[PDB]
Design a protein around this ligand. Structure first.
Ligand SMILES: CCOC(=O)[C@@H]1CCCCN1S(=O)(=O)Cc1ccccc1
Length: 190
C-alpha cells in the first residue's frame, strides 16, 4: 500500500514514504520548499518522464525505493560561464538597467547551500537584505567577483570553489574546510 521514494537534484537527496494512491503534489512541494523555492520552479522526472502534481505512484507504476530526479528549468535556457578564477555563474533571470560595478554599494537577497544540498544561510530568514560594497573585500571573493555584471531584478547562481569562499577554515559551524558553495543571489538595488 505504501512505497519509499528518493528525490534527488544531484545535490539534495530527500527520502519520502508515500501511499500509492496519493498524488505526488505534497512530495513535490516538500522537496521544493526545502530549497526555499516554489514547486513551479522545478521539474520532476520519473524514468525520464515529467511528473505532474496530480499523478500518483500507482498511475506511474512506481516501486519501492524508486528515484525521482529533480531539475530546475528556466524557460530562457541555461548557460553556465566559467571565469578565469574557476568561479561559475548562471543567470537564472537577467535584470534590467545598468550592470553592477566594482565600487558600488549593492543590496541583495541570497540563499547559500553546500554541495550536499544543505542550506547554510539566507537573507530571507530574517527578511533583511544584505548590503555590501562590490569589490571591497567585505565578502567572500566569489561574491565580489560574481555579483559584478548583475542587473537589478537579476537572479544569478554562483558556484564558488573554496579558495573563493571560506578555504581551509570553513564558517558558521556549518561550512567545512575546502567546500564548494552554491548561492542564488538576487540583486535588489545598485
Ligand atoms: C559577512 C561575510 O559573509 C559572506 O561573505 C557570505 C556572502 C555574503 C553574505 C553572507 N555570506 S555567507 O552566507 O556565506 C555567511 C555564512 C557562512 C556560513 C554559515 C552562515 C553564514
Amino acid at each position: 500500500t505504501h512505497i519509499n521514494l528518493k528525490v534527488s537534484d544531484g545535490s539534495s537527496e530527500i527520502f519520502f514514504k508515500i501511499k500509492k494512491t496519493t498524488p505526488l503534489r505534497r512530495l513535490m512541494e516538500a522537496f521544493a520548499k526545502r530549497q526555499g523555492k516554489e514547486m513551479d520552479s522545478l521539474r520532476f522526472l520519473y524514468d525520464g518522464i515529467r511528473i505532474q502534481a496530480d499523478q500518483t505512484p500507482e498511475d506511474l507504476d512506481m516501486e519501492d525505493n524508486d528515484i525521482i530526479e529533480a531539475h530546475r528549468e528556466q524557460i530562457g535556457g541555461s548557460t553556465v560561464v566559467t571565469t578565469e578564477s574557476g568561479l561559475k555563474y548562471e543567470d537564472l533571470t537577467e535584470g534590467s538597467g545598468a550592470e553592477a560595478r566594482a565600487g558600488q554599494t549593492v543590496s541583495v537577497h541570497y540563499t547559500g547551500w553546500l554541495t550536499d544540498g544543505q542550506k547554510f544561510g539566507s537573507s530571507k530568514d530574517r527578511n533583511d537584505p544584505f548590503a555590501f560594497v562590490l569589490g571591497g573585500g567585505m565578502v567572500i571573493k566569489g561574491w565580489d567577483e560574481g555579483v559584478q555584471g548583475m542587473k537589478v531584478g537579476g537572479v544569478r547562481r554562483l558556484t564558488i570553489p573554496p579558495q573563493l569562499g571560506y578555504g581551509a577554515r570553513g564558517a558558521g559551524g556549518v561550512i567545512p574546510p575546502n567546500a564548494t558553495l552554491v548561492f542564488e543571489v538576487e540583486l535588489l538595488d545598485v
